[PDB]
Amino acid sequence: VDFHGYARSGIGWTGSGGEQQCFQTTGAQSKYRLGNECETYAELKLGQEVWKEGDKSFYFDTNVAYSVAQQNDWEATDPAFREANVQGKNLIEWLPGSTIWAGKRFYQRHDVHMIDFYYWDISGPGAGLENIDVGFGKLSLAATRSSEAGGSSSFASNNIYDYTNETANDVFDVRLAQMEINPGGTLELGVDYGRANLRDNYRLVDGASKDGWLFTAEHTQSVLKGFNKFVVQYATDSMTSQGKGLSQGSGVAFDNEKFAYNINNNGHMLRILDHGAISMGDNWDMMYVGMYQDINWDNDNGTKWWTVGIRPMYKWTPIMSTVMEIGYDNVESQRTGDKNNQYKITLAQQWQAGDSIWSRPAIRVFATYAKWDEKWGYDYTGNADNNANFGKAVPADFNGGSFGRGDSDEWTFGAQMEIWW
Amino acid sequence: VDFHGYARSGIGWTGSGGEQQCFQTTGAQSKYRLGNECETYAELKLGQEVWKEGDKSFYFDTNVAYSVAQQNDWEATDPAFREANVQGKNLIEWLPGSTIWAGKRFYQRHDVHMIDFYYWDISGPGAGLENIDVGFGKLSLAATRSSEAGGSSSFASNNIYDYTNETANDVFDVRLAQMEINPGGTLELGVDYGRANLRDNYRLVDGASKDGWLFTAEHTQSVLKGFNKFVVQYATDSMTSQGKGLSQGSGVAFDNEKFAYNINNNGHMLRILDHGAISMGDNWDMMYVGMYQDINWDNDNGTKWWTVGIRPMYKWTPIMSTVMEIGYDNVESQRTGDKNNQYKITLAQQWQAGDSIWSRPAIRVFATYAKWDEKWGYDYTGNADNNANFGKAVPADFNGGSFGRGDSDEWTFGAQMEIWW
Amino acid sequence: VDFHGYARSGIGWTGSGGEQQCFQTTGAQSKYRLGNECETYAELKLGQEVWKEGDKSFYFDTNVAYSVAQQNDWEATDPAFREANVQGKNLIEWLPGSTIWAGKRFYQRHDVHMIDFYYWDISGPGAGLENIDVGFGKLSLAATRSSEAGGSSSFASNNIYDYTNETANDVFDVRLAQMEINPGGTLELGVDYGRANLRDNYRLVDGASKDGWLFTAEHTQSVLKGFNKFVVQYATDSMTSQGKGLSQGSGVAFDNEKFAYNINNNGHMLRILDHGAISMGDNWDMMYVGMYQDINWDNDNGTKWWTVGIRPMYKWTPIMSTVMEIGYDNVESQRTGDKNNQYKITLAQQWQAGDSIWSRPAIRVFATYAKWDEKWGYDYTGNADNNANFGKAVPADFNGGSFGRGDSDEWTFGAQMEIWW
């Protein structure tokens, strides 16, 4: 049996008092992780090549993820069965070296480690013909599936509260990768088309986005004994809310009291990302990000986000280092024009099985300091029925109440292990 | 560690619109599976021979099953811990070659693959002395356990709503197998006696069946490089509802509003089954079923079911084939005499690790067409309290409302992998 | 992958009727297990040495526990993700042979097998520097974490119902072990300091214990080809309720109707334990316990417990034996001075992979007899709001109702497998 996975677990404390806390800017879709992760998370993969004959094989792979608060020993939880697929490589003579698969599978996900941000990820139940050699590059075709909690109506209402049927979205993906635009540089282009797929006779709310597009171009350049990726993505309508390749064509959300509420996503997103890891010498490794993401919604409730951070590792020993992370966010409300921002600085002493900034397991002992000043937040007071501004961006002091994390500080510290295998 | 299991996962679509749908006749206890399975289902077994000394060994085996809707990636679920037993072979000199076991175990289950129908399955927590060599055959003894949600009362009421205590049924199984009635043919006989086992001072409803019998005779004949099994089972009373060897001696069911309702099973069942897989040549494999099951209840709410289907596989290549399935059901209501029926036809193109119709993993791309015309259904409107006909068979148009799937059509299609290992 | 664990599963019956029942004295924190365990319980560990270089290694270990009623096959359950840690041995030159770890880990738990009683167990999320060679012995340092369901208030109330915030306790452990006080004897000393760790601005109820101490001294003496441990522990205040090393500094409990209720633990506990396993000859093994535990609470609701039992195994064969267990409990209510007591006698025939009373797997067929006579119980009638005596010890016949198990008998029997691997 092949045993792989990912896991992170630890203990921590907040300077002001109590268990460790984590800091994410309101409106940002990520946090700089080093010394800022507050759960035990683990994926346990057990797979196996079940049949080989020469070039041909069938591999079976699975994934069972667990998330717990790590505030206690016995922590019951509903695990998420995330992968259960079969890949058959070289089963087609005419298209050599290509694999056909089916089943739930984490499919080719691009992400930015330090901020734990997946920026291209259409995984889920699906099927596809992967790595077709096309000469100048490798072509891949897939179709995955997601489903929104409700958003579909059995009959025509004018009442949004009537749209409570789970609504299935489909994504059709096409990628062309490994094209050598230049020396040391490769170029990948992908196109995603997602659409809400309605049952016979069901309807989406009036004005619902229905479908959309995600367009990706990633360029990897080999540098300083590491790499650097430069991405530019542009999504449209139903692809703007999730913003990684998954569709939400219905536009209806539900409050905690089961009330439907219209969160239309007609609009667009433009994401320009650059990240990488570069070694410099024998004592320095450094991971780094820079992003600018702008979701512009027709309903004025978008956001314009900017991040930047660096994680330079300095190696005292082939197995002992001192890692430090510094991240900055700033999100501006599309609706109000206000701005939330934060800066985090973590200083960690780690021991890892390896001399890389990518080597895992790592056992860290760290201290984190975050200072924010947020001038807006989302109104989630009341209920989708009591509240008409439910879910809208709103200034910090709106109607006397308060929104957002405020203008403050905090520092935490602890020990944690992280590992992929 | 020994890693085994079963799993099926895939993506699909319904012709009319939306996610793929599955077709089962109302009253039938099964559906023809090819291109008609709508969930990711998986059992992950991890076992291990923990001690061997010569002929003697102790094997530990476990099973954790997961069922998810496969409409999304992250799908939290409560897994069912199904197996955790220990088998000690050859630990008894006097009864050589025999195994003693204890623990929850899937115990010797007979089933019919294409319709996924288990017809003899008493698995659950249990214990037993297995494979005792008796000369003409091998004798096996077991005792397993099931428990009904309620159906037992702490005191004597006349009110069924008072019978809400979980009620334990016990099954005592005895099988004699591997007797060579003829050349190429073996014969197995089994006898099951199940009884509801009441706590001191508890009572079952008046007229409750309490106990029952299941009697099985299976004959396996080696044929056309495959086999053919011919079964005849006859159950009695408390064994008629589940109809695979498990007892339900209490007769009380509960609606979704926690209301008890009397579903007495005094009566009998007669099941006559014939199924098998036969190869013909080097290009054809064919799986096939034929069944007639009649549950005759004292309360007139039984059913008389007939199925027939065939799954002929034609092999283009040692690893690529074209499988096709055609199934037919017809269930007649014992209460009303009406009839629900359906015919399914699936056409699939698969790639499998093997040249058999039994070879797994298989990766399929299929299209299914089902056409039904049901003239009855069960009344589950209202609640066991509002409704007096709750749970009874009732004609399609009963009291102006409607029951059953109607008279219709639909076609689906998709890709799916299936595998046992 | 390394596959380890623990599991027990079986089938049983109660003499009087129905499924098997288990007998524990009211007020006792344990039951003599042989032939007195009523669930399938299993921990499935999958770990792996992920990196070794000479003396240095990093081991990853995990644990997923399942508990089910074993009254049926399909038993859905929320598994408890209990372990997910990484241990790095020999990563520090200055402190050779020592390990540093982080993650949720079952950390050095002392327990008494036949009664399944852990008497020193601070496991949970944590971190630490283990096995530091100190010359005369090995010094270990750890910090683990627990959290109480509520017990903390966001503001100052005088209303206990206001204290519903989860409250984190921290434990700081220090042990010095393997000191050879004598020939064949070792001595371990540990000191635990636990404190409720409040968020900025939160408050605990007035009079809440807040913190406490656990002090342990265990002495292991090698004897009769086995051992004998003699423990003496003394805890204080917040460490008296759990009584194994974990803190509960808040003092608030909640009824099933979400009502807070004050269960202050200011006071102390004195536990004097002696247990062991000794072989005598080639046919006799015998496990044995003797304990006296006194929790004296300031609020008069403590208890004074005494147990004694022996499990002598007589070996007919290297793989077949006859085990028998005899246990006795007696708990006196601190509040009322009454006494609950019981005596259990189990007689089992087992087959195990080994000639030891410690050899697993074991497959048992047993019969148990328990006879109790309890004269007090806890009042859990009503709700923390209806009831003012909620949770207090109270005589059997208090206010006409009844408390405790009564004065009775019962006998059970069944088959069960148990195994650690």
Ligand SMILES: OC[C@H]1O[C@H](O[C@H]2O[C@H](CO)[C@@H](O)[C@H](O)[C@H]2O)[C@H](O)[C@@H](O)[C@@H]1O
């Ligand atoms: O599959 C590995 C990652 O899974 C989880 O990530 C989820 O949560 C993220 C935001 O918190 C999403 O961006 C992502 O799409 C989700 O799958 C897990 O929380 C991560 O830590 C894992 O690396």
Ligand SMILES: OC[C@H]1O[C@H](O[C@H]2O[C@H](CO)[C@@H](O)[C@H](O)[C@H]2O)[C@H](O)[C@@H](O)[C@@H]1O
């Ligand atoms: O254990 C393997 C099978 O388990 C499940 O079967 C359950 O559901 C069937 C009806 O849908 C019952 O006949 C059977 O008794 C149940 O155990 C699973 O759904 C099957 O696909 C598996 O092959």
Ligand SMILES: OC[C@H]1O[C@H](O[C@H]2O[C@H](CO)[C@@H](O)[C@H](O)[C@H]2O)[C@H](O)[C@@H](O)[C@@H]1O
């Ligand atoms: O981790 C192995 C043991 O875990 C469980 O024990 C829990 O329940 C005990 C009381 O019933 C507590 O003393 C203990 O702290 C808990 O962890 C399990 O029920 C045991 O059988 C296992 O051996």
